[PDB]
């Protein structure tokens, strides 16, 4: 099993003076950190959110981010002054940074940037570059951003070394929560007809849900999307379209790792 660690920053710039930056950090589908614009500090959302970093190593890393947030905010504002009137407020910037861990001691890091909701810029190798489809005017900010050797060196060290080391640590400290098994609970209902099988409370996310006449799997079954619950478990429903009157004989069967072979079966 491969985990993706994701630091997700969202920044809104309304005009020349108003601005807010918020971040969430994810390991797989679990939240590890929260950093609200309102807060001077980054909040742990798990007891193990510090990984295997000493208090000193953490205070130091946080301080670097604290300053980055202020730095980031002013740099965007100066960059808009360089482009104007070409580009104008309100502006949305999103960042998606982190690494994907692999078997052995292998990983892969990324730092993706989106402007007004379109993916345009990444850090690759030793420099910022625009991605295919990006507007040409971005070449000025790229050139400006790439003159900053100190930021380059830092980001390279953040992506090649810091991420993987830190995420390894999280994987150890959070093993208990990462490998938790939570049992689904299922129930049935209908609208006009259309039968609905509700599945809720399960973790992890791989789940099998099929409507069945006895032991023949109904072809018509339609799974919806995975919807989150507040307690970090999942919710899924599978609907089957039928002719009114033949609701008898049909069953909902659910397979999930937490059950340990005891499939859930429900009849209408």
């Amino acid at each position: 099993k491969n985990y993706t660690f994701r630091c997700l920053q969202m920044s809104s710039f309304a005009n020349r003076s108003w601005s807010r930056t918020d971040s969430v950090v994810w390991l797989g589908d679990l939240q590890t950190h929260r950093w609200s614009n309102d807060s001077a500090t980054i909040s742990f959302t798990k007891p193990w959110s510090q990984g295997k970093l000493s208090n000193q190593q953490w205070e130091k890393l946080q301080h670097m981010f604290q300053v980055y947030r202020v730095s980031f905010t002013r740099d965007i504002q100066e960059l808009v002054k360089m482009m104007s009137p070409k580009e104008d407020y309100p502006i949305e910037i999103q960042l998606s940074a982190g690494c994907e861990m692999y078997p052995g001691n292998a990983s892969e890091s990324f730092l993706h940037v989106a402007f007004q909701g379109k993916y345009v810029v990444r850090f690759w190798g030793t420099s910022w570059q625009t991605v295919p489809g990006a507007p040409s005017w971005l070449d000025l900010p790229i050139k400006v951003l790439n003159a900053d050797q100190g930021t380059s060196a830092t980001v390279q060290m953040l992506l090649n070394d810091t991420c993987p080391l830190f995420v390894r640590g999280l994987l150890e400290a959070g093993k208990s929560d990462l490998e938790k098994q939570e049992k689904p609970v299922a129930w049935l209902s209908s609208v006009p007809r259309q039968l609905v099988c509700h599945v809720s409370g399960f973790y992890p996310k791989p789940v099998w849900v099929m409507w069945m006449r006895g032991d023949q799997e109904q072809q018509g079954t339609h799974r919806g999307d995975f919807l989150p619950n507040a307690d970090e478990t999942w919710y899924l429903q599978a609907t089957l379209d039928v002719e009114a009157g033949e609701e008898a004989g049909l069953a909902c069967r659910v397979k999930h790792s937490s059950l340990g072979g005891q499939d859930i079966i429900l009849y209408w």
């Epitope: 002054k81 104007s84 400006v144 003159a147 900053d148 050797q149 930021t151």
Partner: T-cell receptor
Framework: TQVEQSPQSLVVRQGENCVLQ??????????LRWFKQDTGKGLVSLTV?????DKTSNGRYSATLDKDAKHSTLHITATLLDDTATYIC?????????????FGAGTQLIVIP | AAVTQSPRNKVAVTGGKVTLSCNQT?????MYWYRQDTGHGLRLIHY???????EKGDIPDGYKASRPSQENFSLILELATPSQTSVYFC??????????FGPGTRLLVLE
């Protein structure tokens, strides 16, 4: 303010060495520059220090920077009369044009011939 | 890489109109105006990121800037006042961090 220099002024006999201090709170601190300004003239750059712990030299001028302490010194060896001037400390908060320079008010040096 | 300023020195009256000019041929995008008064470091008045625009620095009040072209950045004092007595420095630069300073302009504004 964010950049403090000391001493405010000093008087030195030709041939004596002296040392000028600059302490700052600027964040971040990408690089530190020392200028020399003759009375009435303009700003001649002496050196620029850019590393966490750095040392530079330029003729009879040498300089140290410590980013941990946010402290820099400028050493003049064997002062000449031409060294009579204002020495100015300037910190840049970026490694590019997105930055702002933060100027100290300077240290006034007089060399007695 | 050279920067020039004119006039180099100017006497003017309160209510008068003063224009300080800066010229730079290095093909630099960026230009900056500062004033230097004793007991203070240089302070940023106005700056410019390219031919055609101008931005407020830290002490913009009493000054208007104008960037008509890549080579020229000028600082306009519409209604000159004694407190604008000072030495003024212009600078240019590319995308890197070094600024290149002009020689300076002494301005005295008498009542």
């Amino acid at each position: 303010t964010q950049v403090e220099q000391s001493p405010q002024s000093l008087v030195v006999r030709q041939g004596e060495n002296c040392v000028l201090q600059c302490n700052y709170s600027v964040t971040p601190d990408n690089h530190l520059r020392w200028f020399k300004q003759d009375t009435g003239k303009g700003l001649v750059s002496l050196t620029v220090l850019v590393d966490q712990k750095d040392k530079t030299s330029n003729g009879r001028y040498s300089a140290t920077l410590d980013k941990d302490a946010k402290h820099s010194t400028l050493h003049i060896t064997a002062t000449l009369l031409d060294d009579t001037a204002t020495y100015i400390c300037v910190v840049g908060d970026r490694g590019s044009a997105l930055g702002r320079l933060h100027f100290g008010a300077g240290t006034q040096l007089i060399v007695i011939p | 890489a050279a920067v020039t300023q004119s006039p180099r020195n100017k006497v003017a009256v309160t209510g008068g109109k003063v224009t300080l000019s800066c010229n730079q041929t290095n093909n630099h995008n960026n230009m900056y105006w500062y004033r230097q008064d004793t007991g203070h470091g240089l302070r940023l008045i106005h700056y410019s990121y390219g031919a055609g625009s101008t931005e407020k620095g830290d002490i913009p009040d009493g000054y208007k800037a104008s960037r008509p072209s890549q080579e020229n950045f000028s600082l306009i004092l519409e209604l000159a006042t004694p407190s604008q007595t000072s030495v003024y420095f212009c600078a240019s630069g590319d995308e890197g961090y070094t600024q290149y300073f002009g020689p300076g302009t002494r301005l005295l504004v008498l009542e």
